[PDB]
Ligand binder design. Structure first.
Ligand SMILES: *[C@@H]1O[C@H](CO)[C@@H](O)[C@H](O)[C@H]1NC(C)=O
Ligand SMILES: *[C@@H]1O[C@H](CO)[C@@H](O)[C@H](O)[C@H]1NC(C)=O
Ligand SMILES: *[C@@H]1O[C@H](CO)[C@@H](O)[C@H](O)[C@H]1NC(C)=O
Lengths: 445, 445, 445
């Protein structure tokens, strides 16, 4: 609900609080069928223009079917298949003899129906397009009996419209080797997705959540090609199940913290590592290091726990006491003092070093703050942009409250001569141990 | 105009000169409107095939509108929104009461018109599609008055053509959460983009530049979904403003420089860091470290200063004197002598080590040069390919002149016993300081 | 044929064996032409609805042609053009005067024909669409002679179908600056690709290979825009030639190996580097470090040797003896004991450290194995999932046989006080040399 922020002057880091979690922990697989007709030969001696148009669209249908057939013969084994294994396990069941007839019977009278497969999975199946009925009722009388009947122009247009979804599904599945993500409206219309959300064995609060964030749901779903066999095109849609809901989530922002001496080459730097999204999860903290794995929509984060690390809840103490013995706070060291800025949720961190011109402006007043050398921060209240060198950054104009937590920059507690610079994924105590070892070589002399 | 290159044998690096800059420094936002009709209920008792086709296409229009409505209810907050903040600020203005009516009045008689918003921004708006006029004039008489009028077959076809752009715009905006880049021809036709370039408050030389590189302009633009309200679909197009033009730009290429001793494990390596694009910018140098942030078209580089670092102009002295005290030239060290090649603008750098077979061939003559162990270079004049191990590289056949700058490889100035290997983002003086400290422990003994 | 796996308990690494190679070593370029008509002015005074539809579709054709013209004026020079240089060399030939007429003559009577260009390249050309014949035969009589003839409604529909492929090709080429990959069905239909495979100067076993993996072939192909000139639209399709076939290939999986002491901060870690795909190639080993450069379909790996490194065949000895003097086995060191898992081809590696809950379950029996602290492994026979912390991984259910190679974890052979931690791309002997140097400072005291 309320977004807040905290800048820690001592460590050149900020934490954006108040976000609610939605972490993916399960998969809900569903079978999507398209009833095909298997027509073959069309003896046609008629040259009528309407007949040519029908036979042309019929060839686009036959090629789409043969393309899906050579696509299903080749079964991809790329990546670790660890995130589609649930849907892939369903495709192996669909390949069983008699199994396509079971789903074929349930969708005889209705479009949607729950089916208990021969492996105990009660999947929700769906007949989203019925080409067997259209081709066999409206098209066969036009291309059998030796000479073609003349179809009306409405039929020529109606068949291009119905056949189009088959061709586009074949188009996406061909370039992506049978596995598409996000799931497009051709694979599943918004109307079908929302109806599928309603039919899911989930809570009413979870149906409201997925229905209000369908675009994020599509981006966290998979469409897997199964089999085309016996006048049935089947493919599995894997939708996310968010097992973790409304747990506090926060985003850590970090920026280099160097000393500001006047003789260059005598300065040492330090940067907190593991910036990104953190969410409370089952007595621990789920950390997401990669930037593209979490979508945020209005204070709710939607993450996939597949690309997370599980950390003890004491990892949060790097935000209140970085020198705290319960968790070994990770840092990186260097002597590379290049200016930069980080746009946070409610403001901007600015690390200004050397001769760089760093400033913060309001659109109508101009420069309202000039940063000096070191690491500093400014809230978005009254600030529109931040300029660092030749680069202009826009501050997020989101409502919230920032808190500037003053403190001595910790880089000032380190003697430069014995500082271990050039270390990457190092801990606070690792740096201290290298300092205790470098102090013993001077102790003897 | 004239592309030139310089290979520095001493540092196993090359610089491609003669490129002209175009750096993005501003945004030009523009509002694109599509006039919708808001039709609701269609009482139809007619089963005529033309009437069915019209009602089917009308349902595809109503679903596209409801999809855009649930897309605008959910307002994405992903990334730092720092590069769309200008267009996002316009969407907040469009949400003001009475503001959609202002743009609604200016586009009453013409398609394009400049509008001064209630926040001082004079945006260029555009009515690119008029569905309210088509639906209300050609379609309502067909689906009101209790029984349907029969439309001619030309109307069935004309409505599928007009409604198509709405459906494709809804398709792109749904899978991308309202923010698309590059900007497609559905969001803005080439005809509309070029007319928008002509109508921009920019110089005539800048209009000629953006019009001759429209594909790069699309790739550096954003299309942001605003609001659908009161028979208006509005979305913001953010086009790049290139504040830096025709400044010299150059590309640094680097490759590992190792020693070539005959006993493996006794060799030390060194590689210049910060390879990429450099452009002179406002008395400093704008550096672009990531590879996908700069598009080159005929000697002009098109960069976004958002992903640049601002460096002092002395950074260029690493190209003429790497041991120069005005700038601390950055390197990385190791003992990893694996062969590789870098295809430059006018030739190829080859780092050959161990037993690797390195060569340069002409298509009809065969092998014309065999590289020995170390770092070397060959121009594209007479060379077509370069082979390193089991890999074949093609040399760019672009016209230009290469200059081979001979010099002693600097890795030979380092005593191996005290060389600091295994260092990554290290400076020349950092390595020298580790060498002065390792020489003091031998001095005492 | 038979997939096997080997987990090495001593190094916390696994090797998936039995895969067959298909490495790209060459390019087969081919010219794809679309015959255009160059119609200009359409004097039309008729307001007939069929005439409007024809003139509307004719404007979509003229804009597609002018868009391809401004696309070919701007010739992109992005990337190093090292992987399209073969097709780009063909575009420079097509720009020669008289050269478009040569391909224009061979495709006068047939759709496909081999053409010897004026640079010695015998390319296979193709007339995939004939718009000059359709526009000049069916459309000109409708828009010349001062007043328009009335076309039948079949012609209105037939022209939207034929013109569609031109518009989609223009759509893809515009957003991608003339170079598209993978190659879509609009650039080349599956029917045209398979016919092109049949017409290629390759072995019959190679035609069967590319035809059974057309989707991988598309993903490893390029479509390059050449020229639109003199009623000809020409573009080059670059298809992969797999010069390395059926050589053994294997995939190395690595995971951190730490000590399991009870006092945290007293533990040291080690991880094998260079995980990925290895294939025997011409007496050496071709290594692929990036994850997206190799597609696997049923035991065959399809790699591009462009993004490989050539290593001596002794690199495989890191899998049988990591302490072996023929190859300096690379590792990275640290003290960062965070739990993780790696899903391999036939099982899962689990590195469990600290308080993390690590387990392996069967869908119906529940937890069947609890991992203790250290690095361990489980086969997919009887295991469905592996849980580490708050993350659930799915094991690949592929048939094969795993071999658990027991051995002492090599991290136990290192004295912690003198262990060099914090090293990244370091060799076994590099770590040993840092240990021999740290042992001399204690020897004197
Ligand atoms: C460094 O030495 C002091 C004095 O013995 C000790 O109190 C401190 O804990 C040591 N720190 C580390 C990280 O070894
Ligand atoms: C190393 O020592 C010499 C001799 O005192 C000095 O002249 C040189 O500048 C030193 N270099 C560094 C990088 O400390
Ligand atoms: C370390 O020292 C021993 C004893 O002299 C020697 O046998 C061994 O090979 C040395 N190892 C390295 C990597 O220097």
């Amino acid at each position: 609900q309320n977004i807040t922020e905290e800048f820690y002057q001592s460590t050149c880091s900020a934490v954006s609080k108040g976000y609610l979690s939605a972490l993916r922990t399960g998969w809900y697989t569903s079978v999507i069928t398209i009833e095909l007709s298997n027509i073959k030969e069309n003896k046609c001696n008629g040259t009528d223009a309407k007949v040519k148009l029908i036979k042309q669209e019929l060839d686009k249908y036959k090629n789409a079917v043969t393309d899906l057939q050579l696509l299903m013969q080749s079964t991809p084994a790329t990546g670790s298949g660890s995130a589609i294994a649930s849907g892939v396990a369903v495709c192996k069941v669909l390949h069983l003899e008699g199994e396509v007839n079971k789903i074929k019977s349930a969708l005889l009278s209705t479009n949607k129906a729950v089916v208990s497969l021969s492996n105990g999975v009660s999947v929700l199946t769906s007949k989203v397009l019925d080409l067997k009925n259209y081709i066999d009722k409206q098209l066969l009388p036009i291309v059998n009996k030796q000479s073609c009947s003349i179809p009306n122009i409405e039929t020529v247009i109606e068949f291009q419209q119905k056949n189009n979804r088959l061709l586009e599904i074949t188009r996406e599945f061909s370039v992506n080797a049978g596995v598409t993500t996000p799931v497009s409206t051709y694979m599943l219309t918004n109307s079908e997705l929302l109806s599928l959300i309603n039919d899911m064995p989930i809570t009413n609060d979870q149906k409201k959540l997925m229905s209000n964030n369908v675009q994020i749901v599509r981006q966290q779903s998979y469409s897997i090609m199964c089999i085309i066999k016996e006048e049935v095109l089947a493919y599995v849609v894997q939708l996310p199940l968010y097992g973790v809901i409304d747990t506090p989530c926060w985003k850590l922002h970090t920026s280099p913290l160097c000393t500001t001496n006047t003789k260059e080459g005598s300065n040492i730097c330090l940067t907190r590592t593991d910036r990104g999204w953190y969410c409370d999860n089952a007595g621990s903290v789920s950390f997401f290091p990669q930037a593209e794995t979490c979508k945020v929509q209005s204070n709710r984060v939607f993450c996939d726990t597949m690309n997370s690390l599980t950390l003890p809840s004491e990892v949060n103490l790097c935000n209140v006491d970085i020198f705290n013995p319960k968790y070994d706070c990770k840092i990186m060291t260097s002597k590379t003092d290049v200016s930069s800025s980080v746009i946070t949720s409610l403001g901007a961190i600015v690390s200004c070093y050397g001769k760089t011109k760093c400033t913060a402006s309001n659109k109508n007043r101009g420069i309202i703050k000039t940063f000096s050398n070191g690491c500093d921060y400014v809230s978005n209240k009254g600030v529109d942009t931040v300029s660092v060198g030749n680069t202009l950054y826009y501050v997020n104009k989101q409502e919230g409250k920032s808190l500037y937590v003053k403190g001595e920059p910790i880089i000032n507690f380190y003697d430069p001569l014995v500082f271990p610079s050039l270390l990457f994924d190092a801990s606070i105590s690792q740096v201290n141990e290298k300092i205790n070892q470098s102090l013993a070589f001077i102790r003897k002399s």
